[PDB]
Amino acid sequence: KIEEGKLVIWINGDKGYNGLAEVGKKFEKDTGIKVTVEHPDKLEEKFPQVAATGDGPDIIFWAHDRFGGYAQSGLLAEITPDKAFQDKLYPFTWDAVRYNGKLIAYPIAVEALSLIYNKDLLPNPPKTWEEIPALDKELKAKGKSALMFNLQEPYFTWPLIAADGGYAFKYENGKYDIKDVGVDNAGAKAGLTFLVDLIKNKHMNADTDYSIAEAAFNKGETAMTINGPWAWSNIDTSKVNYGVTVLPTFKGQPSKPFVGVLSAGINAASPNKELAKEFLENYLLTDEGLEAVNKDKPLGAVALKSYEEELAKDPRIAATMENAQKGEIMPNIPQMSAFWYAVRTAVINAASGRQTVDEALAAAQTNAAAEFMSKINDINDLVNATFQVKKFFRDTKKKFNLNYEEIYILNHILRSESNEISSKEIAKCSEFKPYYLTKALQKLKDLKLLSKKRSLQDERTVIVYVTDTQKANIQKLISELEEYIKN
Amino acid sequence: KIEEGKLVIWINGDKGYNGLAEVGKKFEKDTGIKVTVEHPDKLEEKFPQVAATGDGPDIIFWAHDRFGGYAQSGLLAEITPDKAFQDKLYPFTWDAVRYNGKLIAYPIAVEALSLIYNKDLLPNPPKTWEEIPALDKELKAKGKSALMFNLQEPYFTWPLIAADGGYAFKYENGKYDIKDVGVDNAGAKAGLTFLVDLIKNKHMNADTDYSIAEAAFNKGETAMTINGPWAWSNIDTSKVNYGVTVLPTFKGQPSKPFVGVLSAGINAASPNKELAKEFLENYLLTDEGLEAVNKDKPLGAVALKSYEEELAKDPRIAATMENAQKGEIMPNIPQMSAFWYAVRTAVINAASGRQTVDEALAAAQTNAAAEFMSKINDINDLVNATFQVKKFFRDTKKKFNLNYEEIYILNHILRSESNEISSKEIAKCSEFKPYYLTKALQKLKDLKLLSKKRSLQDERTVIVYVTDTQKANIQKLISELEEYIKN
Numbered sequence: 001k002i003e004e005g006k007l008v009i010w011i012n013g014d015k016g017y018n019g020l021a022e023v024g025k026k027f028e029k030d031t032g033i034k035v036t037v038e039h040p041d042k043l044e045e046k047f048p049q050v051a052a053t054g055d056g057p058d059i060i061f062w063a064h065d066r067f068g069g070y071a072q073s074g075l076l077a078e079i080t081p082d083k084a085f086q087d088k089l090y091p092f093t094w095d096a097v098r099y100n101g102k103l104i105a106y107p108i109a110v111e112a113l114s115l116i117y118n119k120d121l122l123p124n125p126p127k128t129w130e131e132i133p134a135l136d137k138e139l140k141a142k143g144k145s146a147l148m149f150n151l152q153e154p155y156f157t158w159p160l161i162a163a164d165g166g167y168a169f170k171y172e173n174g175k176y177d178i179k180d181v182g183v184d185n186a187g188a189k190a191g192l193t194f195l196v197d198l199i200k201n202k203h204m205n206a207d208t209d210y211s212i213a214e215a216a217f218n219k220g221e222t223a224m225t226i227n228g229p230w231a232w233s234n235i236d237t238s239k240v241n242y243g244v245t246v247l248p249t250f251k252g253q254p255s256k257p258f259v260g261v262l263s264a265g266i267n268a269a270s271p272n273k274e275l276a277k278e279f280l281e282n283y284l285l286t287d288e289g290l291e292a293v294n295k296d297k298p299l300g301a302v303a304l305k306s307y308e309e310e311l312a313k314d315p316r317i318a319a320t321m322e323n324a325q326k327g328e329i330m331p332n333i334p335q336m337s338a339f340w341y342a343v344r345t346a347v348i349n350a351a352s353g354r355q356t357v358d359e360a361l362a363a364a365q366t367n368a369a370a371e372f373m374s375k376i377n378d379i380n381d382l383v384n385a386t387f388q389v390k391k392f393f394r395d396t397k398k399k400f401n402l403n404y405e406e407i408y409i410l411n412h413i414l415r416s417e418s419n420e421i422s423s424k425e426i427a428k429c430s431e432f433k434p435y436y437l438t439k440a441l442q443k444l445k446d447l448k449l450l451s452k453k454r455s456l457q458d459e460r461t462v463i464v465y466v467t468d469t470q471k472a473n474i475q476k477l478i479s480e481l482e483e484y485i486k487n
Numbered sequence: 488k489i490e491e492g493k494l495v496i497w498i499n500g501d502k503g504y505n506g507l508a509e510v511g512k513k514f515e516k517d518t519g520i521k522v523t524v525e526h527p528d529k530l531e532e533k534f535p536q537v538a539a540t541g542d543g544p545d546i547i548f549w550a551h552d553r554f555g556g557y558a559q560s561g562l563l564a565e566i567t568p569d570k571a572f573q574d575k576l577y578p579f580t581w582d583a584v585r586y587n588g589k590l591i592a593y594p595i596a597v598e599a600l601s602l603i604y605n606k607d608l609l610p611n612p613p614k615t616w617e618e619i620p621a622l623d624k625e626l627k628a629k630g631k632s633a634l635m636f637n638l639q640e641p642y643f644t645w646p647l648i649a650a651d652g653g654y655a656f657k658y659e660n661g662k663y664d665i666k667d668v669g670v671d672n673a674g675a676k677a678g679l680t681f682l683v684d685l686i687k688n689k690h691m692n693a694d695t696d697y698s699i700a701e702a703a704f705n706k707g708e709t710a711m712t713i714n715g716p717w718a719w720s721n722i723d724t725s726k727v728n729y730g731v732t733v734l735p736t737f738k739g740q741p742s743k744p745f746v747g748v749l750s751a752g753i754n755a756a757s758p759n760k761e762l763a764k765e766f767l768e769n770y771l772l773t774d775e776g777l778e779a780v781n782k783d784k785p786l787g788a789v790a791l792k793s794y795e796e797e798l799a800k801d802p803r804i805a806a807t808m809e810n811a812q813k814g815e816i817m818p819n820i821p822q823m824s825a826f827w828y829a830v831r832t833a834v835i836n837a838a839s840g841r842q843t844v845d846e847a848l849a850a851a852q853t854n855a856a857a858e859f860m861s862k863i864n865d866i867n868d869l870v871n872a873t874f875q876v877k878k879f880f881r882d883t884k885k886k887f888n889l890n891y892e893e894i895y896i897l898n899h900i901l902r903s904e905s906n907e908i909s910s911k912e913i914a915k916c917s918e919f920k921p922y923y924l925t926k927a928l929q930k931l932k933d934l935k936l937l938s939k940k941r942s943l944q945d946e947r948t949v950i951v952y953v954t955d956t957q958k959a960n961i962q963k964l965i966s967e968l969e970e971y972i973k974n
């Protein structure tokens with residue numbers, strides 16, 4: 001029940017929701033339809049839950065990295081702006097909101113973690129991470145602290161782990177090899193071990209967090225923090241003489257902050273799509289609209305060309321956009337949430353002292369690439385799960401005589417970047433039986449949708465190939481038999 | 488990973504955590520083991536999440552109403568204080584922390600919403616709710632507001648809905664009929680409709696909240712608020728001439744504030760149980776310990792007899808304890824969280840204006856009497872689930888040849904209040920096959936743990952009976968084969 005006739009927006013708490021609300025009112029003024037902004041807590045996780053139910057906001061705002069998995073689940077409506085309109089925005093921002101050839105959300109503003117310091121407490125910010133353990137005892141001297149940033153969310157500690165070779169999922173020919181996870185490499189271990197030690201040497205504690213670090217900096221207690229545009233508002237009225245700049249380099253390399261494109265996705269459930277499209281296209285993505293929000297909180301380097309040729313003047317923005325370039329754009333693929341988790345754990349677990357970086361990261365690597373996030377804790381959850389499963393198949397037995405192994409495959413395929421997979425992949429993943437695996441690939445082959453599958457080269461591992469129109473029919477079928485459980 | 492050798496406590500933010508921390512230090516002094524208190528935000532919901540994972544605090548503090556569902560899930564350790572000790576506390580407080588014959592948490596202090604007003608702005612508090620819409624325009628006159636209390640959490644608006652016949656789950660022969668939900672009755676509709684209108688007539692707005700109302704009162708802007716002992720601290724330094732008293736009566740009946748027993752449950756996962764038990768029994772539940780915290784924030788009518796014979800002197804306490812009596816003790820049963828939800832929704836939805844009390848409550852009644860569970864949304868969740876299941880059995884095939892149907896039963900039994908169940912129960916619940924159901928009961932019977940099962944009276948709906956030592960072995964087995972799915 002999304003309730004027609006109005007817009008409900010979900011935007012994160014550290015952002016211009018009051019500003020966006022202004023946009024929403026100008027809309028109501030002209031349109032006549034009301035818009036109400038809300039900043040649920042943890043809307044990124046809450047969205048897929050309530051949105052799977054067919055409820056939730058009409059529009060959800062968040063970094064483009066979550067939208068891949070949303071669109072995947074079917075939570076997001078496909079946006080179809082004409083070419084003229086797309087021209088008002090930077091080609092690379094649409095790219096971030098493009099998933100499997102479709103545009104899933106509107107890009108709003110580019111975000112990158114900048115380095116912010118207190119010029120009255122250090123008119124000269126260090127340009128490296130190694131020349132800091134020292135700068136801490138010098139400022140720890142006059143009763144202060146060198147650095148203080150959020151150590152709870154891996155979005156902040158990633159730049160350091162990334163800098164020297166840490167990476168999400170290897171990238172190459174336009175695709176991401178979700179199997180190739182770079183978080184347990186030398187470069188990754190390096191930056192983390194450093195962060196770990198910065199703590200061991202009482203320079204900063206494992207429990208620092210956004211709230212803590214933000215005050216600590218705005219109240220002069222710390223010489224510098226690590227944050228983005230949205231945080232400038234507070235520092236502004238906290239009227240401190242601060243500067244935004246390049247993230248210190250590690251082992252010589254710059255910090256590679258994952259970059260996020262704050263985008264607005266329209267709920268697939270929503271019954272107000274034409275309205276949301278009109279709000280975002282005609283109202284929000286206009287100079288007024290964007291500045292309206294920028295006033296409340298900094299959007300950073302907006303995606304809207306026109307207005308960005310104003311924000312660009314600002315050295316803060318140019319600083320953001322500089323850090324941006326040095327970092328990589330966040331993948332929008334579904335396996336991202338799994339990535340963020342693996343990392344969150346690893347960091348917290350090793351900064352605390354429960355694990356040695358090696359451990360934290362070896363587990364982290366495994367977790368980041370695991371195909372499944374196990375949702376079963378109690379045997380009651382087991383029973384719960386078993387009941388659900390058992391029910392599912394029995395209901396689809398007649399029509400769709402698709403057994404588990406089969407369903408598993410079609411799914412593994414649909415959630416795949418590649419149009420060609422090997423019996424090895426599908427075998428390593430899923431404790432399957434060579435007997436059923438093969439019988440299953442066959443079972444689907446015999447069906448005009450599994451597309452060709454054919455003897456490996458090396459042999460003993462048949463390659464599974466799926467067309468483009470093939471992968472289109474596997475989708476239409478899943479969406480079809482997915483009605484038997486989606487409720 | 489709970490980390491042995493220390494205590495981590497989770498207590499709600501509006502309470503004596505600094506005071507509790509003092510207790511924790513006296514402990515560390517004598518013991519040598521450290522204790523760190525923390526007030527996560529929304530620990531009541533966050534606990535079951537992180538605690539299901541096998542992580543979380545060693546000790547969790549909260550109103551006894553949540554503990555039923557915690558113990559249910561298996562999150563809570565069973566506390567076994569000797570009789571002599573139990574004598575130091577009021578028999579009724581142990582009753583609140585007793586679930587299915589076991590003691591799940593230590594009772595700490597009784598809590599009830601009192602009525603607090605500003606004597607300098609009204610030395611005479613109204614004694615009814617009807618004689619208030621008026622008292623608002625008289626104080627709204629000299630630039631003030633009559634009432635201002637939290638309208639977001641249904642814990643505050645319940646007293647009014649309860650007063651005239653609103654009730655959670657009907658109670659009678661010592662049991663709660665979770666099917667009999669009294670929130671859509673006449674008495675319920677009445678009090679809500681009143682609250683609704685108090686807003687319509689611009690006496691108070693639908694968005695008031697703890698924060699807002701608390702300042703509004705402490706800053707003299709409002710003549711009275713609705714709150715409990717923990718809020719007296721702020722009003723104290725806010726040095727206002729306030730008084731704590733009886734909640735105005737509605738339609739003639741007193742306000743029935745759900746009463747909560749702040750209890751301390753020990754995490755079932757925790758590896759420090761003997762220590763937590765020692766902390767709570769030997770340190771926290773002593774006169775010093777309790778007053779240490781009472782200083783920080785008022786506990787209200789403590790459960791510890793000795794110290795309560797001091798607090799009882801205070802007219803505030805006697806006011807609390809008076810309101811308490813007029814209200815009912817909150818049920819500790821699992822269906823409580825579902826209750827709190829249904830109500831939260833209904834209230835907010837109808838106070839806002841989105842729904843007419845009728846609607847809000849009819850939905851609320853339905854919701855309060857529902858069950859909830861990870862239902863699987865995506866076929867990817869299906870695959871996810873199937874993989875988990877399939878794996879589980881294969882791992883327990885050798886050691887524990889317990890098939891699904893069997894596991895299902897032992898679980899249904901363990902999560903049962905009764906020590907006797909009928910083939911009907913286990914049959915209606917679980918689309919089971921009469922063939923397997925029976926074969927399964929048999930399979931377990933043949934095992935020395937399913938206890939007796941024997942021909943019904945009525946039909947051949949065989950009655951399943953489990954000892955007391957029987958239900959103890961079914962538990963030890965589940966905990967045993969439950970290691971195969973831990974994460």
Ligand SMILES: OC[C@H]1O[C@H](O)[C@H](O)[C@@H](O)[C@@H]1O
Nearest residue numbers: 012014062063111153155260
């Ligand atoms: O906590 C990390 C998050 O911080 C802010 O919300 C950023 O806008 C968002 O892109 C990022 O994902």
Ligand SMILES: OC[C@H]1O[C@H](O)[C@H](O)[C@@H](O)[C@@H]1O
Nearest residue numbers: 063065066153154155156340
């Ligand atoms: O640090 C973890 C977080 O980083 C960024 O905020 C991502 O946008 C978000 O998805 C993730 O949870």
Ligand SMILES: OC[C@H]1O[C@H](O)[C@H](O)[C@@H](O)[C@@H]1O
Nearest residue numbers: 499501549550598640642747
């Ligand atoms: O908001 C409701 C809560 O208020 C206070 O924290 C009470 O101590 C607690 O018993 C209750 O659950």
Ligand SMILES: OC[C@H]1O[C@H](O)[C@H](O)[C@@H](O)[C@@H]1O
Nearest residue numbers: 550552553640641642747827
């Ligand atoms: O209003 C809802 C809340 O009411 C009381 O405070 C309960 O103790 C708490 O568990 C519940 O969530």
